[PDB]
Design a protein around this motif. Structure first.
Motif, short mmCIF file in Angstrom:
data_model
loop_
_atom_site.label_atom_id
_atom_site.label_comp_id
_atom_site.label_asym_id
_atom_site.label_seq_id
_atom_site.Cartn_x
_atom_site.Cartn_y
_atom_site.Cartn_z
N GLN A 63 5.68 0.61 -6.16
CA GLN A 63 5.35 1.04 -4.81
C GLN A 63 4.65 -0.10 -4.09
OE1 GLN A 63 1.67 3.92 -4.99
NE2 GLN A 63 2.89 4.32 -6.83
N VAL A 64 4.58 0.03 -2.76
CA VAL A 64 3.97 -1.02 -1.95
C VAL A 64 2.45 -1.03 -2.07
CG1 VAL A 64 5.87 -1.18 -0.32
CG2 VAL A 64 4.07 0.52 0.03
N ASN A 65 1.85 0.06 -2.56
CA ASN A 65 0.41 0.07 -2.81
C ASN A 65 0.05 -0.79 -4.01
OD1 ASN A 65 0.12 1.88 -0.67
ND2 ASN A 65 0.31 3.67 -2.02
N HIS A 66 0.99 -0.96 -4.95
CA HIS A 66 0.74 -1.79 -6.12
C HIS A 66 0.69 -3.27 -5.76
CE1 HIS A 66 1.79 -3.93 -9.90
NE2 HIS A 66 1.03 -3.00 -10.45
N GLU A 112 -8.11 1.83 -8.70
CA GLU A 112 -7.25 3.00 -8.63
C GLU A 112 -5.78 2.63 -8.56
OE1 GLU A 112 -7.61 5.62 -5.25
OE2 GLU A 112 -8.03 7.36 -6.52
N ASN A 113 -5.46 1.37 -8.24
CA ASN A 113 -4.08 0.92 -8.26
C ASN A 113 -3.53 0.80 -9.68
OD1 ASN A 113 -4.75 -1.31 -5.47
ND2 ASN A 113 -4.16 0.85 -5.49
N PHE A 152 -2.14 3.84 -9.99
CA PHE A 152 -0.95 3.86 -9.15
C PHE A 152 0.21 3.11 -9.78
CE2 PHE A 152 -3.22 4.40 -4.75
CZ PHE A 152 -3.62 5.67 -5.12
N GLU A 153 0.27 3.05 -11.11
CA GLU A 153 1.15 2.13 -11.83
C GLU A 153 2.59 2.61 -11.73
OE1 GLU A 153 2.84 1.62 -15.24
OE2 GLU A 153 3.28 -0.25 -14.18
N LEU A 197 -0.04 -4.30 -2.55
CA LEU A 197 -1.06 -4.48 -1.53
C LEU A 197 -2.43 -4.72 -2.15
CD1 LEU A 197 -2.46 -4.18 1.33
CD2 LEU A 197 -2.24 -1.70 1.00
N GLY A 198 -2.82 -3.86 -3.10
CA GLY A 198 -4.14 -3.97 -3.69
C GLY A 198 -4.30 -5.11 -4.67
N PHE A 221 -10.77 1.18 -5.05
CA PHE A 221 -9.38 1.41 -4.68
C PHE A 221 -8.43 0.50 -5.45
CE2 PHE A 221 -5.72 0.56 -1.83
CZ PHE A 221 -5.17 1.83 -1.85
N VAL A 222 -8.80 -0.77 -5.65
CA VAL A 222 -7.91 -1.67 -6.37
C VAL A 222 -7.92 -1.41 -7.87
CG1 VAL A 222 -8.12 -3.44 -4.59
CG2 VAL A 222 -9.56 -3.56 -6.65
#
Lengths: 42, 91
Positions: free
Chosen positions: B78-81, B70-71, B74-75, B83-84, B67-68
């Motif tokens: 966003q808050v997922n960038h 996959e971040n 996710f480039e 978080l991971g 998942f990290v």
């Protein structure tokens, strides 16, 4: 009923160590049908 | 038996890092999102149950590293960038 000649005593103190944590040894066979440990019979 | 145990603890050490082991090969499900480990054959079921209770920590380590990484796909902003990448600090 006879099976075979004796093992060693140092093998016994390690086999009791494995059954305490929940891991089968060479003499221990876990039976899922009863959820119990089983030593050999003879 | 103890030399085959010190055999194992190095093969255990190889899969903690996320690296393919020596006698433990990794079969990818969809690309190692969930790792199906193929450990070598046993001549003693005593040590087979010892390695069997260790491999869930590398199963859970394979999901977070999937998942990290996959971040990087996710480039964006966003808050997922954030978080991971903080999860990468925990890794």
């Amino acid at each position: 009923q006879p099976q075979l000649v004796l093992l060693e005593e140092t093998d016994l103190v390690k086999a009791v160590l494995n059954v305490l944590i929940g891991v089968v040894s060479s003499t221990f066979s876990y039976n899922q049908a009863l959820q119990s440990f089983a030593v050999k019979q003879g | 038996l103890p030399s085959q145990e010190t055999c194992l603890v190095e093969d255990l050490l190889y899969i903690l890092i996320g690296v393919d082991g020596r006698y433990i090969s990794v079969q990818p499900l969809v690309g190692r999102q969930s790792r199906s480990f193929s450990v070598e054959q046993n001549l003693d079921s005593s040590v087979k149950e010892l390695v069997n209770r260790i491999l869930p920590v590398a199963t859970n380590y394979s999901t977070v590293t999937r998942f990290v990484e996959e971040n990087s796909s996710f480039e964006y902003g966003q808050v997922n960038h954030a978080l991971g990448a903080a999860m990468r600090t925990l890794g």
